[PDB]
Amino acid sequence: RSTLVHWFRKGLRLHDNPALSHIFTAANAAPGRYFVRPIFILDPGILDWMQVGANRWRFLQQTLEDLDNQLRKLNSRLFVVRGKPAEVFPRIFKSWRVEMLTFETDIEPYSVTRDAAVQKLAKAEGVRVETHCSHTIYNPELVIAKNLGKAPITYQKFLGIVEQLKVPKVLGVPEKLKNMPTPPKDEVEQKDSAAYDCPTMKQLVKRPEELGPNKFPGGETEALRRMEESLKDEIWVARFEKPNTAPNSLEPSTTVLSPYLKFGCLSARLFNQKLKEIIKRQPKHSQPPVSLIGQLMWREFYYTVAAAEPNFDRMLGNVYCMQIPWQEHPDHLEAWTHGRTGYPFIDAIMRQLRQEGWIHHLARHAVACFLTRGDLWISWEEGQRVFEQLLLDQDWALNAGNWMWLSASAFFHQYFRVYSPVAFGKKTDPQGHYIRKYVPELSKYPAGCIYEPWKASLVDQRAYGCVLGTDYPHRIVKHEVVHKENIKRMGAAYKVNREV
Ligand SMILES: Cc1cc2nc3c(=O)[nH]c(=O)nc-3n(C[C@H](O)[C@H](O)[C@H](O)COP(=O)(O)OP(=O)(O)OC[C@H]3O[C@@H](n4cnc5c(N)ncnc54)[C@H](O)[C@@H]3O)c2cc1C
């Protein structure tokens, strides 16, 4: 006999998964011919390429478990193989007599190299590789080609292109495996019958003390549930305007599908389709960019630009990225990183992020502006690194693209609009409920100065039971000074970049 292998990296789902579907249709149209091994490889390699926080490990843990459960309903299971792909594939190709290897493609530079290295080994051992582009609605390679070789650097140009592009058909779940034996133990399974079993919380989350609330359980199952719940309110869906959603409401004002899209637990293609259906039905609806489909197109846009630039996540050697003399201030960085900037609004955001691993888009704006061009004049690369560690939805392309946007390094050039770490939150949370929740030391402060505790007299501070400098830090910088400085600095950097 011989093996068919689906390799999950992203695309952690059964729905709308051409790569997995193909393996399943194949084994069913030729029964008794083939063994099926859907695998995930727990690469030690990415830990050296990427920071991963406790919260994201738990989401991946929950994601793998859900995928196991899902595959067992199809008369299969998930095989979680430990080890580096370069070491793993030689072995299993031979040890499993692998005829076909499918996977969903991915544009991240680590993926690209790892995937080419595997496609080389697969050719050498006569293994048939078929790859699918189903992580994004559009193939960035087709977008780029339609634009004569370059990625469009504006949303609207991007939209122009993708509008004249074929929407792909969305698949359903694969047909249950008909009459499949469980693959016979291999060399590794024989010495340990649990060696390909889904990791437990304990194996994956080395730092259990860093886990915040379990709010967004990983996995396809929950992604589909959460999507169904979001689309319930068709008016909210149809009329959605991203800029008008609150960053600091206590419940998320957007869908929080981002972690599910990031891992491929939800197909972006299914989501786009379901949204299309609601828009046909609802004649009064918002349009890109502010619309919900618009949000998905942002995702497509950043994937397209990122696909064309291997150094997307760094300032140096990045065709898109303004060269800016960011400064090193390790103290300021640490204070920002841990929400001890002494700006409550910023602190609350940084604290929500560390605890829960998701914050609203405009909350990300606020903190990212503060760290970079707004206040601390720290490289967006540092911000990126902390987001990468803390966000459930951390996404190489999306994280880098937005950081470049926010720091006015790329795509956005109007650096003289600066968020106020004092005023910005006030528009949507005048009572400061959000701040009370995440910065509870300040909970006794009236709304009049909860955004601005340094406005309270020392004796009122004692009264509120939080004295600035002992219970809550003084501001690490004075917004009113530094932001004016940073505009000049930005102005200078823009000029020297203009003249190269
Ligand atoms: C500094 C910074 C860093 C960011 N890092 C990430 C990241 O690592 N991963 C991530 O998924 N998003 C990132 N974003 C984009 C955006 O903030 C999040 O996608 C959004 O907050 C996720 O919440 P949601 O799913 O409720 O979004 P919704 O408003 O419900 O949007 C639905 C989906 O559309 C996509 N989307 C929405 N906004 C954007 C956007 N600005 N760019 C690209 N796609 C978008 C996401 O997949 C999101 O799930 C970042 C934004 C900023 C400003």
Residue numbers in the entry: 5 to 504
Provide passages from the article that reported this PDB entry:
We employed synchrotron-based serial millisecond crystallography at beamline X06SA at the Swiss Light Source, with microcrystals of Dm(6-4) photolyase supplied to the X-ray beam in hydroxyethylcellulose using a high viscosity extruder. In the dark, Asn403 has hydrogen bonds to water 55, Gln398 and to Trp407, which is the first tryptophan in the tetrad. After illumination and reduction of FAD the side chain of Asn403 moves into close hydrogen bonding distance (2.2 Å) to the N5 of FAD˙−. The data establishes that Asn403 actively stabilizes the negative charge on FAD˙− by donating a hydrogen bond to its N5. In the light structure the indole group of Trp381 rotates about 34° towards the solvent. The solvent-accessible surface for Trp381 increases from 2.1 Å in dark to 51 Å in light, as estimated by AREAIMOL (ccp4i).
pmcPhotolyases are blue-light receptors, which repair damaged DNA using visible light. In photolyases it is the precursor state for a second photoreduction of FAD, producing doubly reduced FADH−, which in turn is necessary for DNA repair.
